[model samples]
Target chain A: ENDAYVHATPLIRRLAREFGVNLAKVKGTGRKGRILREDVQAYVKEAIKRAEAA
Target chain B: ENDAYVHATPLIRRLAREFGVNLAKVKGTGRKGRILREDVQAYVKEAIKRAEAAP
Candidate 1:
């Protein structure tokens, strides 16, 4: 349950915070479980799409 | 940053609990972010592959 041991750079971490995306929730496709900017943005995109009345 | 709002059924949740697979980490290919059985297994498979000395 504790997937809180997330990995992300300072820049990516800031981006996540700004986008309100949780690093723990975003799948890290990067090397060594490192969360990338694309991953964060993709998560946000998915979230946004999910919220739409499609 | 609240991805903790995961979606899974009792069966899938139990499977995840037993496999020690965090549902939050697994990508739900199912509709509406619903975590399927394959998702859990796939996450495990990916994790296993990531741990290997791959080509």
Candidate 2:
């Protein structure tokens, strides 16, 4: 297995859980591919929302 | 705006970013309501996969 990754904010995790998303599979764009706040929001609005609804 | 929150794993955040899932909206179930590694994985496997498949 690959090394573990970390997120930038807790809220990002929380929102992900609400939508039921996994962080590991994602390729991070932050420091060392770390998660970012804006990234989280964008994910929810652009990606997750559509996924969950569909 | 509300108080800022944090996630458990960096990988989780990465996944969230890919799927565009906002972490802040999720309620943590870990210590002090922290995000767990498993949660992130599950979320990605179930929700994100479906979303990406759509468009």
Candidate 3:
């Protein structure tokens, strides 16, 4: 189930894809998994760090 | 800095680290970057996808 089934906009979806981030792994701080750009970015940043480390 | 400066419990933080999730990127459904488990899980799935996709 995507985003645990929540209110992520298509843009967010695209953002997630762009960042290669899975909305499922990101915990939505918004109402009912209202995935936000900020959310995905944080994950993106962290993921990037790990990648760099690797 | 972390979880966008939210109210994620220590448990959540631990979970994030365990899952290698960036709490900063995780949005809070509650007041002040309130991160939840579900959100982290969702992001993890996507991250894993890309990781695997990487050749």
Candidate 4:
């Protein structure tokens, strides 16, 4: 269970980090395990919605 | 950037944990960003495929 290898590029990773979204917890809906910017946006969107309600 | 809320059920989460599969890196092909067990299995499958392709 020492698998930390992700099939994501640096650009998406940076976008994820900028949004405070953990790559491990971010679900990819891309090309065969490809994580994209829109995919990462969902995490931020959820947080904002919850925060607004709180 | 302090967002970490995942919309996954407990059963799938447990399964993911067991396989050392990080849900974040997992892509949800379920109803409304839901992380299913099959998604986690992909990570393990990738690892196996890589391991079996050694020199």
Candidate 5:
């Protein structure tokens, strides 16, 4: 059932945790959909702003 | 004035240009502030959505 799992490096994982971001919600642009640090930051930026609007 | 210029690989440069995104406006999260492909995509995604709200 783990067909299309989320992929992310340990460094990016920490960043996502720090930002309180869910990697599943982030669309990875890295090769093979590997989540990069930029992905986490990008997700967090929009999530924060989106939260502000709510 | 180009001291703090945007940094990105040729691959990412192409991606940004393809998306019609201005690298100057996309904040780089890579080491030494290099712009990554994801950053360009992120900017473009919001940019496109923002454009829809415009006239």
Candidate 6:
């Protein structure tokens, strides 16, 4: 049952991917790291900021 | 106000996500890692390569 794990929705996964975030590294405050909306917003902010700087 | 940067298309982002790859870590051999179709191909290659090895 190694594949048994909470899977993220497409939208959440999309946001995470956009931010260059290691999904494995993010501490999901949601239920079992389900990735809440706030998480996406926070990651987006940092990701956009990093991109702006780059 | 330092906004000079290379923009990526939604398709590329989608591709990157499908591969679970950090574009930043990938060394773009393209015109400044503009993320060409080939780059996407290579990224997909390595990404799948890595995922298969992941626990």
Give per-residue CA lDDT, model 5, range A1-54, as digits (tens): 122233567677655444345567678889988877566556555553453354
Q: For residues B1-55, write the lDDT of model 5, one tens digit per residue.
A: 1222335677876554433445677788899788876776666556534433444
Model 4, A1-54: lDDT tens per residue? Answer: 112124568787555433334566557788775677666555444443344344
All candidates' chain B TM-scores are 0.77, 0.50, 0.69, 0.68, 0.76, 0.52
Model 5 segments beyond 4 Å from truth?
Answer: A1-54, B1-6
What lDDT tens digits, residue by residue, belong to model 1 across residues B1-55? 1243345777876665444555677788888778877776566544543433232
DockQ of each: 0.02, 0.30, 0.07, 0.02, 0.04, 0.05
lDDT of 5 at A43: 57
Candidate 2 all-Cα RMSD: 9.8
Better of 3 and 4 by lDDT: 3
Give a tens-digit lDDT track for model 3, residues A1-54: 364334568787665544456577676677766777667656665664554454
Model number with the top DockQ: 2
Q: What lDDT tens digits, residue by residue, belong to model 1 across residues A1-54?
A: 124333467787665444344467778778876777667655554543343323
TM-score list, all predictions: 0.43, 0.36, 0.43, 0.41, 0.44, 0.34
After superposing candidate 3 on the true structure, give the runs of residues whose Cα lies further than 4 Å from its correct spot: A1-54, B1-6
**Candidate 1 pairs with clashing backbones:** none
The model with the greatest lDDT is 3
* Residue A16 in model 1: lDDT: 49
User: Per model, how many backbone clashes are there?
Assistant: 0, 35, 29, 5, 0, 0
Model 2, B1-55: lDDT tens digits are 1232243366666655555546675556688877665555555456566777795
Q: What is the lDDT of candidate 6?
A: 0.50
Say which docking band candidate 3 falls in: incorrect
The C-alpha stretches of model 1 lying farther than 4 A from their native spots are A1-54, B1-6
**What is candidate 4's lDDT per residue for B1-55, written digit by digit as tens?**
0111245687876554433445666678788767665665554445433433433
